[PDB]
Design a protein around this ligand. Structure first.
Ligand SMILES: [Mg+2]
Ligand SMILES: [Mg+2]
Ligand SMILES: [Mg+2]
Ligand SMILES: [Mg+2]
Ligand SMILES: [Mg+2]
Ligand SMILES: [Mg+2]
Ligand SMILES: [Mg+2]
Ligand SMILES: [Mg+2]
Ligand SMILES: [Mg+2]
Ligand SMILES: [Mg+2]
Ligand SMILES: [Mg+2]
Ligand SMILES: [Mg+2]
Ligand SMILES: [Mg+2]
Ligand SMILES: [Mg+2]
Ligand SMILES: [Mg+2]
Ligand SMILES: [Mg+2]
Ligand SMILES: [Mg+2]
Ligand SMILES: [Mg+2]
Ligand SMILES: [Mg+2]
Ligand SMILES: [Mg+2]
Ligand SMILES: [Mg+2]
Ligand SMILES: [Mg+2]
Ligand SMILES: [Mg+2]
Ligand SMILES: [Mg+2]
Ligand SMILES: [Mg+2]
Ligand SMILES: [Mg+2]
Ligand SMILES: [Mg+2]
Ligand SMILES: [Mg+2]
Ligand SMILES: [Mg+2]
Ligand SMILES: [Zn+2]
Lengths: 47, 71, 111
RNA sequence: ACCCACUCGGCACCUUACGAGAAAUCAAAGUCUUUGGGUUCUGGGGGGAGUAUGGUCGCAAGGCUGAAACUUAAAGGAAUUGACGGAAGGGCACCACCAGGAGUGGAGCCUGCGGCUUAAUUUGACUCAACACGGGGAAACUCACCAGGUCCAGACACAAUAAGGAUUGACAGAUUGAGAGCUCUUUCUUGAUUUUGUGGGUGGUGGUGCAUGGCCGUUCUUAGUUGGUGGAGUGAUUUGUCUGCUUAAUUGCGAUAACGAACGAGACCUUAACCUACUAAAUAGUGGUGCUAGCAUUUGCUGGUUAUCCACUUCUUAGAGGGACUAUCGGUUUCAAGCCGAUGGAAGUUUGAGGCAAUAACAGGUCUGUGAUGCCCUUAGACGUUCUGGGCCGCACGCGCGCUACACUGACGGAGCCAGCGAGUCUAACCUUGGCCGAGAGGUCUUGGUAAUCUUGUGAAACUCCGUCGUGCUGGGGAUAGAGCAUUGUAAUUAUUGCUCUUCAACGAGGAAUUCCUAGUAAGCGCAAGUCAUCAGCUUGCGUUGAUUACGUCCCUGCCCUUUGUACACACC
């Protein structure tokens, strides 16, 4: 009986589903947008 | 199985010791700095790396191994 | 175990199959292993119709005691086949004759 | 004396059952909840126990009378279905025999298993259903074993340590099998990635197949399984599902309280056979014509020419069809299902051979196929993993599958010379024609092919032909062993394989035993594919040559079926 009732509710879920009822800036290119300089320093090689 | 034969004598890994170091940068007096332990000429080593001193040896540690420089 | 399987067998049937079979093997709650058949309606087990009609699957459900096998068998209604033979080779059907009103001394018509 | 009918009283059987019973059954065990003819005797869950005690009878053995405490959830009856038997009756089969064929068992080697040996000789499996099986042909790898050396690839959480440095790496030397910074000397480097501890994970060809999934092997070269309406029984159940006959088959016929059905068998599907009918093909092939070579010449005969053109589809290829249904006729039989012979036919043994294959059982096998998995074990001096080397091949011997032979239906040497199933190279070195060099194995320069196109007509082998040898361990046989040359590979020593010369063992048909097999089959014979860098004496398929003898039975062996017995049902373990 509870098996049947199970199958009956499976028919309810099944028949009710027969009808029923952005964050931009693109991080790929955001490093190219933030690509502006003054991000480092390099000087070396004495003696 | 068999469980534990061995001829004793186990093996330790390593330390890296202590060495608070870099106490070798020499000032003469107030405030001049004469820079003990001469520095490496390899472009990957920006002279912020130095050469160790052993017998016949001046060795660059920044190169994991490479480039014996001898003096 | 019985409720779960029995339901499945009944929903398959309510979906308009010819027949269905469910088997569970492995151990449930008892040390020793058993196995159960759950079947309803019509199925053929042999020959080419097998490749045509019945649909089989086995899934291993992994539980804390051990793992159970789940075998399922669905026999589709060959009448709805829509690509293939529409019946088992077994099926032999005789079209039904029709009552005659004989005699009627001959004459003839004209057009 | 005998026959027939009747009648009293007998010992019994038969058929019914109104009736009775838990049923088996019963003219009483019937005339009982619609409970009363008379009367005697015994029982009140199982053990304890017909025991203890007293009485009494007895020569004795013992008889009669005869308790309790305590213990215990069953014991017991009839019947049903199973399962089993060292009971009876029927069957079926070259994993049985008969008639035989080829053998194995004897020999040398090959290979697996045991045993022994070993630092290790990793391991699973032991009647058919372990032992050329784990696709298990192991040089490294594989790899699980043994002698040794590295590494963490120890997620994540908390804590500790600590930017004055938590931690990482290394040149040379020592060291080491090692050009491993493994460790040590020495001293640069690295920057919060790690280290240390606990908790918790993770990997493992570690254990458990007697904890499991899945898969497979076996019973089964078998024929069994169920429900609808009706008949029987209070019921579990049973009849249907059966004496016989027939069949490869619970395949059918027939008998019939059954009638008609489903799963499994059959059908079905694949492969091999038949199409001068259909549709076609320069990646298949034929005739014709050009172009062309040789020999005869009288037209002829035999070739060349991946397109010089025209046509075709017999052969080849694969699509769609067709065809067989044991047909026709006749014997035999309950004149039923069928079976047998003849004719015809591509085909008439389920047309031949397969695939698929119900219900149910086994402590069959596999945790060493799986990143399938419970639990246990282990987890940094690891049972993780990698690196070097060894081992799985070790040899008084026992067992199994095989290879090659003992020759003259033969070895050898020339010569003839014919298959079929296959496979083959991209971010690569696979299948290989051809030309040269080389006795050989092979080398070298090129080439076609991602393929009906090239290797390849796979010119394979037995076999056919002409010679040499002459019955002598012979030129049969090729084990063992020496010396040399090549190939695969980082590496060939315990010799991967190939080639040459030499060395020339056992074996003269194999005791007791035992395997397989009925037609293009047995047996002989090689080939492709799997494995594969190299290595088949293995397997999976293939085609070539092609017999003898059954066409039967239950004697042996194996298994099914009834009948029967059961105190078994975890079912004779
Ligand atoms: Mg069927
Ligand atoms: Mg079939
Ligand atoms: Mg009766
Ligand atoms: Mg015989
Ligand atoms: Mg013999
Ligand atoms: Mg190794
Ligand atoms: Mg390492
Ligand atoms: Mg830890
Ligand atoms: Mg722990
Ligand atoms: Mg594992
Ligand atoms: Mg098992
Ligand atoms: Mg299993
Ligand atoms: Mg075991
Ligand atoms: Mg047979
Ligand atoms: Mg029966
Ligand atoms: Mg044709
Ligand atoms: Mg004929
Ligand atoms: Mg076992
Ligand atoms: Mg497994
Ligand atoms: Mg071995
Ligand atoms: Mg064998
Ligand atoms: Mg010879
Ligand atoms: Mg010859
Ligand atoms: Mg030469
Ligand atoms: Mg000789
Ligand atoms: Mg002989
Ligand atoms: Mg090969
Ligand atoms: Mg093998
Ligand atoms: Mg009985
Ligand atoms: Zn440097």
């Amino acid at each position: 009986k509870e098996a049947q009732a199970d199958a009956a509710a499976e028919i309810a879920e099944l028949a009710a589903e027969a009808e029923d009822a952005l964050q931009d800036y693109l991080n790929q290119q955001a490093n190219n947008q933030f690509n502006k300089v003054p991000e480092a320093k390099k000087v070396e090689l004495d003696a | 199985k068999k469980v534990y034969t061995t001829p004793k004598k186990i093996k330790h890994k390593h330390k890296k010791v202590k060495l608070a170091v870099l106490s070798y940068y020499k000032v003469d007096a107030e405030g001049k700095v004469t820079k003990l332990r001469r520095e490496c000429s390899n472009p990957t080593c920006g002279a912020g790396v130095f050469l160790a001193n052993h017998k016949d040896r001046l060795y660059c540690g920044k190169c994991h191994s490479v480039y014996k420089v001898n003096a | 175990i019985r409720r779960a399987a029995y339901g499945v067998v009944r929903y398959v049937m309510e979906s308009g199959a010819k027949g269905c079979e469910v088997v569970v093997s492995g151990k449930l709650r008892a040390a020793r292993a058993k196995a159960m058949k759950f079947a309803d309606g019509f199925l053929i087990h042999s020959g080419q119709p097998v490749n045509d009609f019945i649909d089989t699957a086995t899934r291993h459900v992994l539980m804390r005691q051990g793992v159970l096998g789940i075998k399922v068998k669905i026999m589709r209604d060959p009448a709805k086949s829509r690509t293939g033979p529409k019946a088992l080779p077994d099926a032999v059907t005789i079209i039904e004759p029709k009552e005659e009103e004989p005699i009627l001394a001959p004459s003839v018509k004209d057009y």
